From a paper:
Here, we identify a protein (CcpS) that is phosphorylated by Stk1 and modulates the activity of phosphatase CpsB in Streptococcus suis, thus linking Stk1 to CPS synthesis. The crystal structure of CcpS shows an intrinsically disordered region at its N-terminus, including two threonine residues that are phosphorylated by Stk1. The activity of phosphatase CpsB is inhibited when bound to non-phosphorylated CcpS. Thus, CcpS modulates the activity of phosphatase CpsB thereby altering CpsD phosphorylation, which in turn modulates the expression of the Wzx-Wzy pathway and thus CPS production.
To gain insights into the architecture and mechanism of CcpS modulates the activity of CpsB, we first solved its structure to 1.6 Å resolution. CcpS also formed a homodimer, each monomer containing four α-helices. Helices were connected by a short loop and a single turn of 310 helix between helices α2 and α3. However, we could not observe the electron density map owing to the highly increased flexibility at the N-terminus of CcpS. Interestingly, two phosphorylation residues Thr4 and Thr7 are included in intrinsically disordered regions (IDRs) of CcpS. Interface residues analysis of CcpS homo-dimer suggested that many amino acids residues were involved in the formation of a dimer. And the amino acids region I73-L81 among helices α4 was contributed to the hydrophobic core, which was similar to the previously reported structures of CcpS homologs. We found that double mutations I73RY80E directly blocked the self-interaction of CcpS. Importantly, we found that the disruption of CcpS homo-dimer structure directly resulted in its dysfunction in regulating the activity of CpsB and thus CPS production. Superimposition of CcpS onto CcpS-T4ET7E folded structure revealed that overall structure was highly similar to each other; however, we can observe that a resolvable structure of N-terminal partial region is significantly different between CcpS and its variant CcpS-T4ET7E (chain A, N-ter).
Numbering used by the authors:
A (entry chain A): 18 to 88
B (entry chain B): 7 to 11, 17 to 88
């Protein structure tokens, strides 16, 4: 559950800083550029615990399970 | 034809997974490779899987994956 906790915390810190949190997270996943995630409230340091391919693996597994795949 | 439960991405990614599974490949690994690279060559032609992935851009796939995850986990809610 680490990745869901990270993305939750990052979304809420993005929101508090007045960013569009979805756009910034999409930007991070596209680019791997930590600059899309503010340093505020440790958000950038939290997302850097994971590798982008681990984040993508979780997004993909979650999406497929929710759309009817038995993993 | 309706799917009983964006919907095109749902159709594409589930169909790609099942075709990769039928051909004995690691489907998650191949899908991750596509998402990181945008390269349709990570997807076999088999059962129209590559044709379906090529209906989308990598950023549209990533946008849907991110939006679906946040909404489903109650973060964007």
């Amino acid at each position: 559950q680490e990745i869901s906790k990270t993305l939750t915390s990052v979304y809420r810190s993005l929101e508090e800083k007045g960013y569009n949190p979805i756009n910034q997270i999409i930007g991070y996943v596209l680019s791997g550029d930590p600059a899309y995630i503010p340093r505020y409230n440790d958000a950038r340091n939290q997302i850097r615990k994971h590798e982008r391919d681990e984040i993508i693996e979780e997004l993909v597994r979650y999406y497929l399970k929710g759309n009817g795949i038995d993993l």
